[model samples]
Target chain A: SPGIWQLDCTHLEGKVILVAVHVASGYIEAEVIPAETGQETAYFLLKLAGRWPVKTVHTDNGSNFTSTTVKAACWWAGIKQEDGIPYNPQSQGVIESMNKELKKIIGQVRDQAEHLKTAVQMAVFIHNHKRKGYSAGERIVDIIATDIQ
Target chain B: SPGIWQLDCTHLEGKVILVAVHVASGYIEAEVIPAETGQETAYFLLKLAGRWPVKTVHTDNGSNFTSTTVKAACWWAGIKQEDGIPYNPQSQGVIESMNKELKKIIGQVRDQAEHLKTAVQMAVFIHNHKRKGYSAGERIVDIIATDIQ
Candidate 1:
């Protein structure tokens, strides 16, 4: 249950952005900003959230995320910001695995003349819906909840 | 002669700052500021340079040194900045070894001295002028300039 969106940046003159969300319950969002600046990051966050409420945001300690505007936005939105410690991937295990999954699917679609972004989005969609893993002898999606208590 | 300053903040009322330089040859200028911030670092650099022109600066990737203000100051002064790669002390081997020498001298005076700064400076002076092994086999002060160049 992941929601996948291919940001068709080709129409916008090759400024594509990719956004992914959990289809059933969990939410994951990714986007390509025109520039890696604080202003661009703040604007992207504004567009990504829209009217929806966000509980937690996980990211590395990049300059863009550490900027005043981005920090202030998170504070104003009542979203808890989580930064992965430098040189540590366990802190963002989910996204790390997702990135690898995207690479694998991209390889498969590369011969078909499909764009990398499209292949990545398709992989994300498949990941959210695929019934492969088990926890306590139940499907992984069975444990997901969209709402925070 | 090499100058070393042992910095201890345990009893200091304000922020602790340490400055070290080679007195005779003026090969290096190194300082450590307690607070990890751009403002603190900028102030330290201003004080460290004084009327003397700084040629090279070596430091770690600590936020204090890597802050935008520090980088900008180096650019403005036409100073070359060299940073030790994360977790790699050999990248700044000379400075790291100098610190070790200072530590040993500090250990000898720790029992009787109320202030370690002066003792550390004296030790550094000796270390610089005293004949030290090198590829060229000369006192550190005599070879430091050529080594840096």
Candidate 2:
């Protein structure tokens, strides 16, 4: 109880965002929720980022990121999981970039309407495929265009 | 309910960070915790940031954010509270910038040892006062330098 006086007794409330990015190809996916972040969303977003995959995924030591479910999901996917050195987002630049782009895209939709689900799904495509050209667009059309459509 | 199929039936957990920035002076403060963010910490940090004060403090509608205690604290301080437009961090550029700097600062210490607390408190001083010269440092010494010392 001695340290409780210094422990910020009265607390403020907040929300968390879960995002995933395909590091090599630059595909990205994310979720912003009102409550605590969740494992399923993290896994879902990572898997949805693109067809390509990696052997490892890195994150901060948030509860959701460290939970058993998330560890099992990554293991099932055959990807090693690692937590980044806290505070150094520089290494996770890809997803950080995605977060910036997604915040803008999501903000635009709120100005116009609530297509958040489809908008975010469309987001990864545009950011990752913008300069890559039609082959990717074709792949999206064959695979993703209709998901958001 | 149709979309329930797309939503995961299984879910998970998380945490939060409380951060604020003095838009005019470019002063900033932040904290991360396992449960909720605290209003006292927010008020104290903002007060310590520079000499400026806020009549309108923008925040989201989280229970901890808009709680009765937080509202009471602000009212006592004569500070007005406002919520940021959701998904639009662009409107709160100052604090966001603070977060980037704080993260980088905290990251450096972790690469070496365990002064995360004293380290972040110094981050604000180093980043905010470095440009303005020794005047601010003297004031910091008369007030904060000894606290950390």
Candidate 3:
């Protein structure tokens, strides 16, 4: 499950945020949306999958996650979609931590009068830059440097 | 022309680097390709355009830059393509400088046993992270923080 990804959404400042966290690299990709819809999730999924190979995507059985649009996207991309146990708070520990810190940074940036989208992008950038890479003592930027190679 | 970009290609380790330098922010995007061709240029252009809004792209009259493939991509992306005068070194001062420093960094990274693609991506990341943003005293990451807003 090295390429497995955890997907989730959260609401902030009247906008919806779609987040994808890579299980192996801890790399994160996020986008701000007007609403949580199957269409938007499918688009985001394809965009990310275009950049990195996705093996499995783990998500809760939210309506948006279980929609036909996302199913079609998974089928086309040859990605396995896994449904986490509903009501299992600890099942998505990684994503829970991500949402916690992401929301904090988003709130701080938004408080500074930054737009929601800006706040989200900035938060994700900061998070990835500081996070460890695939190996101990290696930064995510280094992993990115190698991946593109 | 804050959104204007200077584009060029250079050979390193038997591969080509397609570089785009943002005029206002000094941000850089680079990719390692197998060869310089109209098809490759068009693909890189659209990929970058998909990531950021490209108002105009400046390039030398290299065959690849002037090819129908690149022209069609520019037309569809609504990006104006400008060709510098042939043999006019001064016309591409910024890109020249970018290539100079980029090549040096790429060479150093390659010497360290890193792959060609890794060398290019690391060099560009270092260049952008430390470069000035759209305004004085601001880093590119901060500009990125505001742009997605």
Q: Model 1, residue A126: what's the lDDT?
A: 42
> On a 0 to 100 scale, what is the lDDT of residue A112 in model 1?
39
lDDT measured at residue B18 in model 2 versus the true structure, 0 to 100: 49
Candidate 3: regions farther than 4 A off: A86-89, A111-113, A131-149, B1-149
DockQ of each: 0.01, 0.01, 0.04
Question: What lDDT does model 3 reach?
Answer: 0.65
Spell out the clash pairs found in candidate 1: A1-A22, A1-A23, A1-A24, A1-A128, A2-A22, A2-A23, A3-A21, A9-A16, B1-B24
List, residue by residue over A1-149, the lDDT tens digit for candidate 1.
11121111111224444443332343334444454555555544443332223455543446645788767645644555555443554425655555566557546645532344334433433444344542111221222211110
Clashes of 2: 5
Worst 10 residues of 2 chain A by lDDT: A2-11
Docking class of 1: incorrect
For all predicted structures, in order, the TM-scores are 0.33, 0.34, 0.48
Best by DockQ: 3
Task: Give the Cα lDDT of each candidate.
Answer: 0.41, 0.40, 0.65
Q: What TM-score results for chain B in every one of the models?
A: 0.53, 0.57, 0.79
Best by TM-score: 3
